[PDB]
Design a protein around this ligand. Structure first.
Ligand code: PMP
Ligand code: PMP
Lengths: 513, 512
């Protein structure tokens, strides 16, 4: 060590002890290259692929060429507050795709951004615009209910029923209700998410992300989420019912005036991933989808469908939600839309709910830039080409890779519990090894580092790049490009059988450095 | 009347301001649109990505480097592997900071995708520090309590009962714990300046003063207190108002007393060296020294936001170094993407930096190889030839400011001030809400004056200016360092024309 270090020291220390301390110098297709002791390029097969950003692989020639052309044409990258038709054009296409895949003829407005978290946060913000609109309306009614009950109570007709007063003379009861209601109005809203949810790591979005050491230090900053148990959905109704909050009004009935509770909108939005990355690639079950629908219908807030990972074809359709029958009101996309080379994202918000203020009170310096716009159109061209046969490829490559994984599970069920996911978004679940015979394995599994250690084995002994997913690296992710070959899938089967035979043997010398 | 899938409202509005144009190509300080007949009309760009284009649109050196990086098969997505370029970029910014401040401090770098993301990394790390302070204080309080309980039970001391307005032993102990836990879970506060603009995401928007942008989202996130930058002698009392204390038991031989102890409510202080949302006002020495006192006093970090002021714009790399602001965290963005890609960075002082952050924060796109490579190029360019790029910025800045000042001197009836430094300048417009012209008065009342004037400049002089400040009350001028004397002259002509029409209250001509 010794010498000054200006970034990544801790991160690199850790990567090294996991066996993952390598620098990749070049990438193409499903292959990334590092330099060995002697200085030649060793090819490594990439199953992580930007955590699912690279449906078309690293540095796809068609995307590279288009990008260089865009650069040579003098594309206007920074043209803020001018007419940028390409944003309308991208949205037209995603709209047409959504209609095709859902049957539904709904229209969405598009707001662009620079990352998944930014796009989800545009959704969070627009959700909260809708709640403020509901809130204003209810408080307007309450005012008129009060004025009415006061004129009945003063002029003569009615008498205040005093048994209602545990909830708080006229003016004093009125002002106490306004005091109560204003306190309630200013309380932060709640967001609903699923357990294992991963929606981004910014100040707002991190609260929507379950992972405990990532989120808990920041609890005090921003509105919280309630993390619904996705596997036991019959439980979700009661948990949301617990969260009801009411405000107060005065209610006239001829001659009796009563203080009464009225429902207050606490919940700003519900968020769901069609396939749940922080949970180990579990797809949302039909039962769960129908509970989310009920919740959205019931509370009158938007269902936000987060397709940062599941979208642009990964699941065997453009939208994973369409595949799995999830009918959201807002949608977000990112990752693969930058083509593997630039940074872009988008929030699609239904036009019958969309509030025009948002188009001019939200904005960003880099958002909607011409270059990533141009690259977005190219990606959508590619994924849609030839009668939508790119999706068919994804399906059949996905089937092939899942069958291999399922075949590996069947012979190694002692260390592998499940295969999860769909299309080319798959994972193996590892059985717990916190109770393991090998000292060195047990200690890593106890630290939540098992998956990373196994990944290091796969790197150094088989030249395959896998990365773990899930809360204690308890899952191994497999999300390669659509061009993944049978030979590469066979090489991965060989590698995995090797890995899980060593893990069966509890061979800690060999697994842990 | 046909289906529309984005930008309908935005485009409606741009059109009525006179700003409804499509640019098809850009190079240097010039953007091009197509006229009725289909030829490229050149427009001089004074907005330049709101200050992102210190080197202009699509600078050949940046374009070429980018295409090379693409041809080389650069690894863009290499998450959780060894990416030396991030350490390299940080080494350089470190060396630059030492050079320009004299200070030999070391900063850790965390990268991101926008200015708001970078500022929010800072927000998050500020709050990690406060949780550490909080844990420590509550640890002491525990031991103060155990001690005061053993004195009170084992003879020596008696509880002085006059202290009890603040809440028998166990009952007083548990009431203190109840009080303290309530206080521990309250959201922190952030301090900013009036007119502050720090980003528009859920967290960052609360740090942004602009009222219609922020107020709808109040309920979501911790608030800021917006300090009055022009009247700093007032800032001490406003922060004092915000003190909150916790309770402990304090032993003095024989008397045990309940007493207050200071609680850290403030997570960070944020400042822009030159304040974009305020119309390009630079932080005065007096204000800087008040921010220093505040940071020393509260023990939270001073976060210096150089998203706009950095990468040379002010005539040094760091605007804070120019203006004598000594922050603990720094953030950069905008010009570091070279005008073509999206990147940002948080520099956090290593003696304050908490190692957990390096592994509990992360982002998909952050630290990508491509914007990394382009970052090194930009830093190479801005540092080249003995740091003469900065000297250029100074001298171009002087020239453009003198023109603006000269325009002010003959048009002081409609122009109050010139603000800013280096190539980050603005004219302040006098209020026109009281204006003679109907059509002008109505736009000024809507907060749209600056946009209307901008439309005049576009259609009658082929110059692109955009307003700044809360009611478009300022006109921004922030072009590349390559801006020419001829272009500056053409802008002087255009401005004299504009402010002569505005003097004339010529609403027919100004408002479409
Ligand atoms: C499903 C999902 N949603 C949101 C995000 C956040 O996206 P980004 O990293 O671009 O901010 C991610 C990235 N992990 C994601 O995988
Ligand atoms: C000083 C400052 N800080 C933060 C931001 C936000 O940066 P971005 O738009 O890339 O999120 C801006 C851009 N208005 C800025 O000028």
């Amino acid at each position: 060590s010794g010498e000054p270090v200006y970034a990544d020291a801790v991160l690199n220390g850790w990567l090294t002890s996991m066996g993952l301390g390598v620098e990749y110098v070049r990438a193409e297709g499903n292959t990334v290259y590092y330099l060995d002791d002697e200085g030649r390029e060793v090819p490594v097969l990439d199953h992580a692929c930007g955590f699912g950003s690279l449906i078309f692989g690293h540095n796809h020639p068609e995307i590279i060429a288009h990008a260089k052309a865009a650069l040579d044409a003098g594309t206007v990258v920074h043209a803020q507050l001018s007419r940028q038709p390409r944003a309308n054009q991208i949205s037209r296409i995603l709209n047409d795709i959504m209609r095709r895949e859902t049957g539904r003829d709904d229209r969405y407005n598009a707001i662009f951004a620079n990352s998944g978290a930014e796009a989800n946060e545009i959704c969070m913000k627009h959700a909260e615009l809708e709640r403020q609109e509901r809130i204003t309306a209810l408080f307007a009614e309450i005012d008129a209910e009060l004025d009415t009950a006061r004129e009945a109570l003063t002029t003569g007709t009615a008498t205040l029923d005093t048994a209602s007063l545990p909830l708080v003379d006229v003016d004093g009861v009125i002002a106490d209700i306004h005091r109560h209601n204003d306190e309630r109005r200013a309380e932060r809203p709640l967001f609903l998410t699923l357990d294992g949810s991963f929606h981004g790591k910014l100040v707002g979005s991190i609260q929507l992300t379950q992972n405990e050491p990532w989120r808990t230090p920041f609890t005090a900053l921003s509105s919280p989420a309630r993390f619904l148990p996705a596997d036991e959905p019959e439980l979700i109704g009661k948990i949301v019912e617990d969260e009801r909050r009411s405000v107060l009004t005065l209610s006239l009935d001829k001659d009796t005036v009563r203080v009464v509770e009225r429902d207050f909108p606490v919940v700003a939005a519900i968020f769901v991933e069609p396939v749940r990355g922080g949970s180990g690639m579990k797809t949302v079950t039909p039962e769960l989808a129908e509970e989310l629908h009920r919740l959205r219908d019931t509370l009158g807030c938007p269902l936000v469908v987060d397709e940062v990972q599941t979208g642009i074809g990964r699941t065997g359709a453009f939208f994973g939600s369409a595949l799995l029958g999830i009918r959201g009101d807002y949608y977000t996309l990112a990752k693969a839309i930058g083509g593997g080379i630039v940074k872009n994202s988008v929030a699609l918000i239904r036009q019958d709910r969309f509030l025009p203020a948002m188009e001019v009170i939200h904005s960003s310096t880099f958002a909607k830039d011409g270059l990533s716009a141009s690259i977005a159109l190219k990606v959508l061209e590619m994924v849609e080409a030839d009668g939508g046969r790119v999706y068919q490829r994804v399906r059949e490559r996905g089937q092939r890779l899942e069958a291999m994984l399922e075949s590996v599970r069947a012979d190694h069920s002692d260390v592998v519990s499940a295969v999860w996911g769909t299309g080319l978004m798959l994972a193996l679940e590892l059985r717990d090894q916190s109770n393991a015979t090998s000292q060195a394995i047990r200690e890593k599994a106890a630290h939540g580092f098992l998956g990373y250690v196994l990944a290091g084995f796969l790197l150094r002994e088989h030249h395959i790049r896998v990365l773990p997913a899930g809360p204690r690296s308890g899952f191994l992710r497999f999300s390669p490009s659509l061009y993944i070959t049978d030979e590469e899938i066979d090489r991965t089967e060989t590698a995995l059988r090797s890995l899980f035979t060593a893990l069966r043997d509890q061979d800690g010398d060999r697994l842990v450095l």
